[PDB]
């Protein structure tokens, strides 16, 4: 019943998947070895969404892990929770992507998709009625974006009526992590927009920024980064898995968050998140949460929403709460902030209610909104790209594996076209 097969690739892909399963593992209360120890009946009624069936009652995740180099996969197997994944889904190369897109999209990527593409089809057919996919990868990384985009491209050609999702991490110009990031980041979206129904952009800079001024822990590590994203990934599917007042499936978010087929980029943020020292000095009431969701700071997106002019957005609450203050507040914030919302889309906010809070709290908020501000990333991503192209700098590598200059310019035109539309759908009056 609408089970979703989760696939992630790339070193950045592995860690997100490496720990994201930890959050979902704790929600349904599955132990490291795969034996159930739940407390209530509900937590095991709707468990077919993520887990298959196996002898001894042990449950294995329907995950596909993909990477081209041995370092990433081996480490994830050694850590805790590393025994759940079955050895069959594993697929790996023997050469290495080398942070070159083409080496990951035409030569090395092509000569291995046959093996990977075989396992994915097996999982899809296994489900009673496939409901969609969900991919996490890295646009600035090689193996992630290298063949990660291509797999997404082929999948669309085979399953047209399904729904597609993506959690892409694109480098921000604040902290640089690869000299060639502008190239592989700029040309990946071109193959991304035409094929990805939904995309959710999360930039590491925002994740780092949130750490200091929300949680206030002196020294953060990558472990902290994964956990924040891990929960947010659950917010989109929060109501889908447990009973609630107003259910909302994955498509329902698509129906109410896509003004046009060519605008499929949002930003995700998680509330509440209060510092350790402020653990007990706060009130867990509806009024407090609403401020955190719409605040310019909390969004994990490099683009500040306040420069923007919202088109549509959604809210996914969790835990037992009344319906007045979920509804009444939604009216207040919109009315008092009508200067930042579209004036030709009345009642442009979606509300859902589910009554099983995350382990250790009593209220939560998962926001995924589409603000015209998301244009900010593309303008800066391309801007640095143009400076690197006028000199044909570093271009010799990309011309040694079959790609020609035609794709580069053609991809550039597509991105610039996407930038224009956002502005057009804002500077207009009824």
């Amino acid at each position: 019943m609408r089970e979703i097969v989760h696939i992630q690739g790339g070193q950045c892909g592995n860690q997100i998947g490496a720990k994201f399963w930890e959050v979902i593992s704790d929600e349904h209360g599955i132990d490291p070895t795969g034996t159930y120890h739940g407390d209530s009946d509900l937590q095991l009624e709707r468990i077919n969404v993520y887990y298959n069936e196996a002898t001894g009652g042990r449950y294995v995740p329907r995950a596909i892990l993909m990477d081209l180099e041995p370092g990433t996969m081996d480490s994830v197997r050694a850590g805790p929770f590393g025994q759940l994944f079955r050895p069959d889904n594993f697929v790996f190369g023997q050469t290495g992507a080398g942070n070159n897109w083409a080496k990951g999209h035409y030569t090395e990527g092509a000569e291995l998709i046959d093996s990977v593409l075989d396992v994915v089809r097996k999982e899809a057919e296994g489900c009673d009625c496939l409901q969609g996919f969900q991919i996490t990868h890295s646009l600035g990384g090689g193996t992630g974006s290298g063949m990660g985009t291509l797999l997404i491209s082929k999948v669309r050609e085979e399953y047209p009526d399904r729904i597609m999702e993506t959690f892409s991490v694109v480098p921000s110009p604040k902290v640089s992590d690869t000299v060639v990031e502008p190239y592989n980041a700029t040309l990946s979206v071109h193959q991304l927009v035409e094929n990805a129904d939904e995309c959710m952009v999360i930039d590491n800079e925002a994740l780092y920024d949130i750490c200091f001024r929300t949680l206030k822990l002196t020294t953060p590590t990558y472990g902290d980064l994964n956990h924040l994203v891990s929960a947010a990934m659950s917010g989109v599917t929060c109501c889908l898995r447990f009973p609630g007042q107003l259910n909302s499936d994955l498509r329902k978010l698509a129906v109410n968050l896509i003004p046009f087929p060519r605008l499929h980029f949002f930003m995700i943020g998680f509330a509440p998140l209060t510092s350790r020292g402020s653990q007990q000095y706060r009130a867990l009431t509806v009024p407090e949460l609403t401020q955190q969701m719409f605040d310019a700071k909390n969004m994990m997106c490099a683009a500040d929403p306040r420069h923007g002019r919202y088109l549509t957005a959604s809210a996914l609450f969790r835990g037992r709460m009344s319906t007045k203050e979920v509804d009444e507040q939604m009216l207040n914030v919109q009315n008092k902030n009508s200067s930042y919302f579209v004036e030709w889309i009345p009642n442009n906010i979606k509300s859902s209610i589910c009554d099983i809070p995350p382990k250790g709290l009593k209220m939560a908020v998962t926001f995924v909104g589409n603000s015209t501000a998301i244009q900010e990333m593309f303008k800066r991503v391309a801007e640095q790209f143009t400076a690197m192209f006028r000199r044909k700098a570093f271009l010799h590598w990309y011309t040694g594996e079959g790609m020609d200059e035609m794709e580069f310019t053609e991809a550039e035109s597509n991105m610039n076209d996407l930038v224009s539309e956002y502005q057009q759908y804002q500077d207009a009056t009824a």
């Binding site: 180099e69 080398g98 902290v175 640089s176 992590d177 000299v179 690197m388």
Partner: protein
């Protein structure tokens, strides 16, 4: 399953590896004889040492390296030293007649009878491997024997293996202190040899290392053994990420795609820090902020070039120890905001950040102290033009008087070759200037 093959040629190359392999020997706990000293070693997934050493079926290990030289004294020195039992007996090929600082001798007359064996031995090593990544070549440019056998072996590599990635740590004579008087000649002739047959090379002129060593360890009278250890340090750094667990990784194949913007410009200079002796060691903090600044400082350049005269092209950073991502993010933030160092208009982001966890080890009886934070840097900057011009001058003056040319015509090498080489060096200078201008 990942393995590499090292190549060192020439007396200078012979000794420099000696220091590096001493470090490599201690890093993985291999006994000097070749047997595991722990005696608790277990099987399964402990073969992380395949990167340099290889199991021999029964007992000891062999270092997957080859030593080639035309002069017996240096090679025989390792044979009868304490390291006798380590190397494969026939992998230390030795010659009979020395080249004698004549590049012609080492590349047309005597060199052709020893390269044949060298290729064969490399054939034996590679076949044993399974995931060959690339080679590492060390050579002494300022010598007739080093260049010839050092060069000719390279061309043979370009055709028999093909696209395999390859790196070289050349040593060009110093700007003002150098041993050989005929150093400029074979040096320039070498410049052609490796320009279009090597992908990457780092400049390690010996004068700087005296400067770096004098200003850090307080030692006034270093010997050639001292210089060797530091170079042994850089080699360990550049390859360390390949062979230990880490959060962010860079491999040998990664470097060639983030440091060479064009095929022609394939030169870059490295730097190291911190290098703090035992005495001064304790009285600091070795904080990332202070460490990162020292690396960019001109005082630490291992090639006698000052980046200030020109602009930078692309810099790669490899950290080791207990560094954390925030520490790095601020550091790169600080460096860019300064004004003393400036970049070109066509490289918006040019930093490649790597992180490891295994701290560097301290060689017994050495000079480097024991520290937890370190930085190994390999930067390609337009300023590298200084090395060639200073060499550029020295070559032309001899020819005008045609001094010493006659021993270069005494082995059959044509008089015209010198004309060809001089043209190519001129081209390389041309290209370095052009990349640095504004759009």
């Amino acid at each position: 399953m990942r393995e590499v093959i090292s190549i060192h040629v020439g007396q200078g190359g012979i000794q420099v590896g000696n220091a590096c392999w001493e470090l490599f020997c201690l890093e993985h706990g291999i006994q000097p004889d070749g047997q595991m000293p722990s005696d608790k070693t277990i099987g399964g997934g402990d073969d992380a040492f395949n990167t340099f050493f290889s199991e021999t079926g029964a007992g000891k290990h062999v270092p997957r390296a080859v030593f080639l030289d035309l002069e017996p004294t240096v090679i025989d020195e390792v044979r009868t030293g304490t390291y006798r039992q380590l190397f494969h007996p026939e992998q230390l090929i030795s010659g009979k007649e020395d080249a004698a600082n004549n590049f012609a001798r080492g590349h047309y007359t005597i060199g052709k009878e020893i390269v044949d064996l060298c290729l064969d031995r490399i054939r034996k090593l590679a076949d044993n491997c399974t995931g060959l990544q690339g080679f590492l070549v060390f050579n002494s440019v300022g010598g007739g024997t080093g260049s010839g056998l050092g060069s000719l072996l390279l061309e043979r590599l370009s055709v028999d293996y093909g696209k395999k990635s390859k790196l070289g740590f050349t040593i060009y004579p110093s700007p003002q202190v150098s041993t050989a008087v005929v150093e400029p000649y074979n040096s320039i002739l070498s410049t052609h040899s490796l320009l279009e047959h090597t992908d990457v090379a780092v400049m390690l002129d010996n004068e700087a290392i005296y400067d770096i060593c004098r200003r850090n360890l307080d030692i006034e009278r270093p010997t050639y053994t001292n210089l060797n250890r530091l170079i042994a340090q850089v080699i360990s750094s550049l390859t360390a990420s390949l062979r230990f667990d880490g959060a962010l990784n860079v491999d040998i194949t990664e470097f060639q795609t983030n440091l060479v913007p064009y095929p022609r410009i394939h030169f870059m200079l490295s730097s190291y820090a911190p290098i703090i002796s035992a005495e001064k060691a304790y009285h600091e903090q070795l904080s990332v902020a202070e460490i990162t600044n020292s690396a960019f400082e001109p005082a630490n350049m291992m090639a006698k070039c000052d980046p200030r005269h020109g602009k930078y092209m692309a810099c790669s950073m490899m950290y080791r120890g207990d560094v954390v991502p925030k520490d790095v993010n601020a550091s790169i933030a600080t460096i860019k905001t300064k004004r003393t160092i400036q970049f070109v208009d066509w490289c918006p982001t040019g930093f490649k950040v790597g992180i490891n966890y295994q701290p560097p080890t301290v060689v017994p009886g050495g000079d480097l102290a024991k520290v937890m934070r370190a930085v190994c840097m390999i930067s390609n900057s337009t300023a590298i033009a200084e090395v060639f011009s200073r060499l550029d001058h020295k070559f032309d003056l001899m020819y005008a008087k045609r001094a010493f040319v006659h021993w270069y015509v005494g082995e059959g090498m044509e008089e015209g070759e010198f004309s060809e080489a001089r043209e190519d060096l001129a081209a390389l200078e041309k290209d370095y200037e052009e990349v640095g201008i504004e759009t």
